[PDB]
Design a protein around this nucleic acid. Structure first.
Lengths: 95, 154, 95, 173, 153
RNA sequence: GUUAAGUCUGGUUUCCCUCCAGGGUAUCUAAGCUUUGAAAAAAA
């Protein structure tokens, strides 16, 4: 746990910038302009969120049947590059 | 007497642009400006910075013109184009460090001049790392836009 | 967002206000102190001793003396009078 | 009708007397009012030949010469080497445009043949060495501008403008 | 009365004629839909740097761009992306010459000499807070005209 | 024939984003109050 003036730079340089390209499939070289970078968040990164629910007979079913069997989801983009899978922990039953 | 990142980059690029006589030096500096920013991100500022210093081969006379560049608009970077480009990018970075008051000009000229002060510069850069990596990549993004704009692609 | 200068105290963010917004709060307080028996001499006095220093940029209780805000705008700062309690709760400076 | 005469502003001491006019009219395009120079003609495509200072013509848009505008004709020892011409007061390249013009004028230029004997490789030189700044305020910025030390006590203002607002490309030859 | 829409009409006229290939027009349309939101979020100077960086200011395209200021027979050549960024650059510069923010003689003498485009960028950096407020409606009109007239892919 | 000595060179160039999507849908006023109270026939 770092100070905020030092931890900002550390955390920001702690992401993964991968370069990708597009191949000109005739010359089999990089298409002109076809070069870009994508930031990723490392695997095993942890985010914290809350799911709030207002009172209803459905909110009960949601919180007792849906959220209890909701473990893995896909977030964000670049899914076919295998870049979205996420586990949900539910502090309720982790802490 | 505060120049925003883009204004600072403009005034640095002006001297760097007038100091590169042969056009091939300018065209190589363009590629330096286009790749060294993501290098600075990936490998860190300090490693990339000493990498740039080494690729410049300051040569004790490239260094003297590099220093005259700070004073007068009449200076000129001489040497191989692929070395003069790295010396011009080193000037870019030093101009930032100096004008942002992060490191003093005398100390930087010393650490470039001879051997002992260089490791003290390494120490000082590790002390001043969060001050530098805070916003230097925006200044370098401006440098990269300017070099892509004002220098023809090879 | 703030980047400190001339100081030795790490701040990653800061509260920012302007004299126009303070003048508006003063109009609110002045009119409401007359249309009701209530009175807010404390808030009124804080706001008025700030508004007395109009024309200068002011840091409230800190001693920054200079800073660059939101990555773009550089400001010199005076300390108003280092005995004014903060109106905000958190221990962040108010510019 | 009116008629002005351009005089170039070099780093040289060769502009003492080549002219026969001091005021002529009632006002000048170039102005100094407690702010510095204004309405400065920017001649482009021409170089300077300070060896007997004149405006050599070139072909570079990059080459230019700057200078001030006052009424008159040169010394009546000319009319065989000057690029005199009439302008409709709009085609003039001016900077710090403060006072508009009255749709017409006439200007004279210190001019010479392009000297078809050598490649004209130019050199851009500013005017520093403040000693030259002072002898240029005295040489020309006093003779025609008696406004100095009469209404204007801020020499060190008109100083800082002459540094940054006046340059030219030189021949080197 | 909104005269920035008429200025947008005439500027769009010039650039819609100066783009021969339809791909260049569609690229200009994408530029128009993107760069106005970009200058809103990011400011004028970063967007201007981005634009001039992707415009390829060689003296060739610079000369076609200068001739656009007079001819209405000028043509912009290059790749579709390059000419679209150059067309948007001409849009901006046209707004700047009109509305008297920048003298046209200075603009032309800067687009000619490479040692003066830097002074041009310096002047534009000095004036950017004014330009940012002025040009919003003009650029929004440019965008509306583009997505109205140029078809999309 | 014998010896003896290695010397030079140590990453360059290009590409830095392209295309589409730039808002869609619903709601667009509702319910009240629509005149009331004084003066209608005056002295010469």
């Amino acid at each position: 746990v770092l100070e905020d003036s030092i931890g900002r730079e550390v955390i920001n340089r702690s992401l993964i910038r991968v370069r990708r390209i597009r191949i000109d499939r005739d010359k089999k070289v990089v298409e002109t302009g076809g070069l870009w970078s994508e930031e990723y968040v490392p695997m095993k990164t942890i985010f914290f969120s809350v799911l709030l629910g207002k009172e209803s007979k459905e909110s009960a079913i949601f919180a007792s049947c849906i959220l209890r069997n909701l473990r893995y989801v896909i977030l964000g983009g670049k899914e076919t590059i295998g870049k979205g899978i996420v586990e949900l922990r539910w502090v309720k039953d982790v802490i | 007497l505060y120049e925003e990142d883009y204004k600072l980059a403009l005034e640095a690029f002006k001297k760097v642009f007038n100091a590169l006589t042969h056009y091939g030096a300018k065209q190589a500096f363009r590629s330096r400006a286009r790749d060294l920013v993501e290098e600075i991100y990936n490998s860190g500022f300090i490693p990339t910075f000493f990498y740039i210093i080494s690729k410049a081969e300051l040569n004790s006379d490239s260094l003297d013109s590099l220093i005259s560049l700070f004073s007068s608009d009449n200076a000129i970077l001489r040497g191989s184009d692929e070395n003069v480009s790295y010396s011009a990018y080193l000037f870019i970075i030093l101009y930032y460090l100096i004008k942002r008051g992060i490191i003093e000009q005398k100390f930087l000229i010393q650490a470039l001049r001879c051997e002992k002060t260089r490791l003290d510069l390494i120490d000082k850069l590790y002390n001043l790392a969060p001050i530098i990596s805070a916003k230097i990549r925006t200044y370098l993004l401006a440098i990269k836009r300017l070099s892509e704009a004002l220098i023809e692609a090879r | 967002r703030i980047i400190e200068i001339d100081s030795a105290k790490p701040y990653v963010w800061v509260y920012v206000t302007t004299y126009e917004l303070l003048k508006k709060v003063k109009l609110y307080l002045d009119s409401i102190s007359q249309l009701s028996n209530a009175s807010f001499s404390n808030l009124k006095n804080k706001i008025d001793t700030i508004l007395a220093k109009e024309g200068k940029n002011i840091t409230l209780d800190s001693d920054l003396k200079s800073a660059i805000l939101n990555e773009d705008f550089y400001v010199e700062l005076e300390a108003l009078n280092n005995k004014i309690p903060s109106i905000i709760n958190a221990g962040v400076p108010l510019l | 009708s009116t008629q002005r005469e351009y005089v170039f502003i070099p780093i040289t001491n060769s502009i003492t007397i080549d002219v026969k006019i001091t005021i002529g009219g009632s006002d000048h395009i170039t102005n100094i009012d407690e702010r510095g120079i204004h309405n400065v003609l920017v001649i482009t495509g021409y170089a300077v030949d300070e060896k007997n200072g004149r405006l050599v013509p070139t072909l570079d848009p990059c080459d230019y010469v700057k200078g001030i505008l006052v009424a008159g004709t040169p010394q009546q020892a000319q009319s065989n080497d000057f690029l005199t011409l009439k302008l409709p007061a709009n085609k003039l390249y001016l900077i710090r445009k403060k006072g508009n013009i009255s749709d017409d004028l006439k200007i004279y230029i210190p001019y010479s043949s392009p000297d078809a004997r050598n490649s004209m490789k130019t050199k851009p030189v500013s005017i520093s060495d403040d000693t030259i700044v002072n002898n240029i305020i005295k040489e020309v910025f006093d003779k025609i501008y008696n406004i100095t030390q009469k209404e204007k006590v801020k020499i060190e203002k008109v100083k800082e403008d002459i540094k940054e607002l006046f340059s030219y490309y030189a021949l080197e030859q």
